[PDB]
A paper describes a structure:
At the opposite side of the haem, Asp-168 and Arg-332 occupy neighbouring positions, suggesting a contribution to the haem reaction with H2O2. Then, the exposed aromatic residues identified in PELE and QM/MM simulations were substituted to verify their eventual involvement in catalysis (information on the effect of mutating haem pocket residues is provided in the Supplementary Results). Moreover, most of the variants show crystal structures largely superimposable with that of WT DyP, except for the mutated residues. The EPR spectrum of the WT DyP resting state (top) shows a ferric species prevalently in its axial high spin state (g⊥≈ 6 and g∥=2.0). After adding 10 eq. of H2O2, a strong decrease in the ferric signal, and appearance of an intense protein radical signal are evident (bottom) (the electronic absorption spectra of WT DyP, and the EPR and electronic absorption spectra of the D168N and R332L variants are described in the Supplementary Results and Supplementary Figures S4 and S5 respectively).
Numbering used by the authors: 1 to 448
The structure:
Amino acid sequence: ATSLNTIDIQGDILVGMHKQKQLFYFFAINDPATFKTHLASDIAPVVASVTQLSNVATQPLVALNIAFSNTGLLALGVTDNLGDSLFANGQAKDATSFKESTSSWVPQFAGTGIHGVIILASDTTDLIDQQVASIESTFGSSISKLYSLSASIRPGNEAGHEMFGFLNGIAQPAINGFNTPLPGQNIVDAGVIITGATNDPITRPSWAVGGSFLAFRQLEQLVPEFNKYLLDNAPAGSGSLQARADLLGARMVGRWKSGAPIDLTPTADDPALGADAQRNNNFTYSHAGFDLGSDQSHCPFSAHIRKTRPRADLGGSLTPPNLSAGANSIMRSGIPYGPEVTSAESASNTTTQERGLAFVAYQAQLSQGFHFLQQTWADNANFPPGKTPATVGLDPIIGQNNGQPRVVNGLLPSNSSASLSIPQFVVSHGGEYFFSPPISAIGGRLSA
Ligand code: HEM
């Protein structure tokens, strides 16, 4: 074990920027000697650390992080093996692992021309734009914007919710020795998330200790379509039609829109529970007097959060906290993008403008984190194992099968064997894998 030097870790990895507005600025490097001078003089000093973001008194006006793709490291003359084959090959080459094609991607992602991403976050877009203008002014032509994506916390009563309306960012792994765990939260070694930290089994280049791999995905959400699907398929029952539709949505996610976990409140929302971080994660999927292998009355086996953090489905403690599959944890720092749903789109139940989630996951091993969750769990009709019926189906939120409707089982409380064939509501437009270096490497090795 080694001490976690949070002064040297970029803040979005373990804290999140937590600003109203964010920009993902995807760049190429020209004239690398010039880029390097400015990386050291202009970027390194303003990169926000975990220590800095952990203190509410030291949030910067513009929170800035930076990460490099494999081709960006090579553009900087860094030929080292960072110890991650998925990172080295790039996300476009990994697309088929997720039963999608780069044919659907933003063209800039379907390749390896992108050398890095600057994440800028501030409470206004004006301040972000000023920082971009400063960067472009000082780097000059040594940096070139290839693509960018603007994102924002949603307005009003949807602040912190993603575009389908669900509170998001509730559940994260706790870093042992750094975070004070919340009830039900998994507790993991720092090296699950931070390269070269405690119990990261993969040897890293020395300069890379304190970094993390950033998996970025531009995930479009078909919000009018999702809403209409829930109404059209709402289970029979006592409430309004919309209340019954809401129940189906909650069964798909594993939480009500308020954040309340269905495992703890399976038939109705509990907004007070959803808001309470001391209670809203305090579950394992186990219930005394129920067979874990067949009981879907509390939460379907196919629910998004159950697919992505299986808890007792992969063994371990039946009482909280369940600590299973710690090595498959990811830190998420996603933020919604695009316009709110327009009046006409809602009325027609049809998407016209692109909106969704600018998905960001951090992990020390891409093969254990984002890639694993997507391929081995969400996209696997027989995961979790040991269930009856054994065919759980796909994750209804993110599960993919090469554009086909997804078979998703267990969603209907009245009959756990009932199956639904559900079109995608989330459409990948691609992304890239980056390495967010420790801050010391920015003006250090990467600028050398
Ligand atoms: C547009 C796409 C997505 C949407 C709308 C979505 C939405 C949500 C929501 C509403 C939650 C529950 C609240 C929370 O804990 O934050 C959640 C949790 C989670 N999501 Fe997703 N998500 C998306 C994509 C993904 C992807 C691509 C992955 C990984 C491959 C993923 C992994 C997770 C994980 C690990 C959790 C927490 C599970 C837990 O610890 O209980 N999500 N997501």
